[PDB]
C-alpha cells in the first residue's frame, strides 16, 4: 500500500504546462502522463512527470492508445539524466475519474506494481489541494458484495525540495502573504476554515440526499464513519465545560486587558512627547 503521496511543485507546473500545450493546439479532454518518483518507507515522493501520447474516445469509453515504446524511451532518458527516479504511477488532468482509468492503471502497473494515480486538476479551486492520489485495490469486500477493481484513495500532500522551494518563492514573491500570524491573516484564515467546513458539510449533505433518494447506493461503510463523526461532536453547554471555558476566556481577557493598558500608556507617552516637541519647536521659532 501507499500511506501518502507527496507531489513536488514541478510535477504540478509540468501537468499545467502539458494541459495548456495540448489544449492550445487542438482540443482534448483530460491529459495523461507518467509520474516519476522515489519510494520512502511508505510515502511515495513524486518529483518529475513526462507526457505520454494518449488518444481516447469518450463515446466508446474502452478505446484508448498509450505509447509503450514512447513511455519506455522517456523513462530511459530520464534514468540517464537522473536514475534515482523510478516510475511510480500516472496522472491525468481530468477533474473526475474515467471508466477506462482502470485499464490505464493496469498498464502502468506493468511498469510499477505500486501505481498511484494523482488527478492533478488544472482548474484553480480555492478550497482544497490540487492532487488526489488513487490506487487499485482488489478485495473480496467481506460484506458479501460483488468485488471489482475500483480505486482506493491515498492521502496526498504537496511538498518541495530546496531548489523547487527557492523557485517557488521567487515566482510568488509578488502575490505571497507575509509569513507570520498577523491578525488580519489569522482572521482571514479562520473565515477560510469556516468556508471549507461549510463546503465539506454541503458535500456530505448532497451525498446523504442522493443516498436517501436512492440515486447512489447506501455504502454500509464510511456511512458509519459519518455516524462516528456525529458522535464525536463536542456537546457544548455542559455545565462543567461551560465553567471551564468561561474561566479560560476570562484568563485570556485579563491578559488582553493588560496589553490594552500597556498600549494606551505607550500611546499617551508618545502623544505627550510629540506635543512637547511641537511646543518647543514653536517656542524656538520666535
Amino acid at each position: 500500500a501507499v500511506q501518502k503521496v507527496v507531489v513536488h511543485p514541478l510535477v504540478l507546473l509540468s501537468v499545467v504546462d502539458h494541459f495548456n500545450r495540448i489544449g492550445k493546439v487542438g482540443n482534448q479532454k483530460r491529459v495523461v502522463g507518467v509520474l516519476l518518483g522515489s519510494w520512502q518507507k511508505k510515502v511515495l515522493d513524486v518529483s518529475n512527470s513526462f507526457a505520454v501520447p494518449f488518444d481516447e474516445d469518450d463515446k466508446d469509453d474502452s478505446v484508448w492508445f498509450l505509447d509503450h515504446d514512447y513511455l519506455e524511451n522517456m523513462y530511459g532518458m530520464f534514468k540517464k539524466v537522473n536514475a534515482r527516479e523510478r516510475i511510480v504511477g500516472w496522472y491525468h488532468t481530468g477533474p473526475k475519474l474515467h471508466k477506462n482509468d482502470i485499464a490505464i492503471n493496469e498498464l502502468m502497473k506493468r511498469y510499477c506494481p505500486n501505481s498511484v494515480l494523482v488527478i492533478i486538476d488544472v482548474k484553480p479551486k480555492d478550497l482544497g489541494l490540487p492532487t488526489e492520489a488513487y490506487i487499485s485495490v482488489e478485495e473480496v469486500h467481506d460484506d458479501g458484495t460483488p468485488t471489482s477493481k475500483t480505486f482506493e484513495h491515498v492521502t496526498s500532500e504537496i511538498g518541495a525540495e530546496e531548489a523547487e522551494e527557492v523557485g517557488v518563492e521567487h515566482l510568488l514573491r509578488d502575490i505571497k502573504d507575509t509569513t507570520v500570524g498577523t491578525l488580519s491573516q489569522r482572521i482571514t484564515n479562520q473565515v477560510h476554515g469556516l468556508k471549507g467546513l461549510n463546503s465539506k458539510l454541503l458535500d456530505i449533505r448532497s451525498y446523504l440526499e442522493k443516498v436517501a433518494t436512492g440515486k447512489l447506493p447506501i455504502n454500509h461503510q464510511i456511512i458509519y464513519q459519518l455516524q462516528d463523526v456525529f458522535n464525536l461532536l463536542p456537546d457544548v453547554s455542559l455545565q462543567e465545560f461551560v465553567k471551564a471555558f468561561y474561566l479560560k476566556t476570562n484568563d485570556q481577557m485579563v491578559v488582553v486587558y493588560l496589553a490594552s493598558l500597556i498600549r494606551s500608556v505607550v500611546a499617551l507617552h508618545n502623544l505627550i512627547n510629540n506635543k512637547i516637541a511641537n511646543r518647543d519647536a514653536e517656542k524656538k521659532e520666535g
Binding site: 504540478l12 499545467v16 484553480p124 478550497l127 489541494l129 490540487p130 504537496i158 517557488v168 510568488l172 469556516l194
Partner: peptide, 18 residues
C-alpha cells in the same frame, strides 16, 4: 494557474484555521 497551483505548497488546510 501556474501561480494559483504554486500557492498550494503551503496553502493551510481549513482545519488549521479552526
Amino acid at each position: 494557474l501556474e501561480q494559483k497551483m504554486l500557492l498550494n505548497l503551503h496553502k493551510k488546510s481549513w482545519m488549521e484555521g479552526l
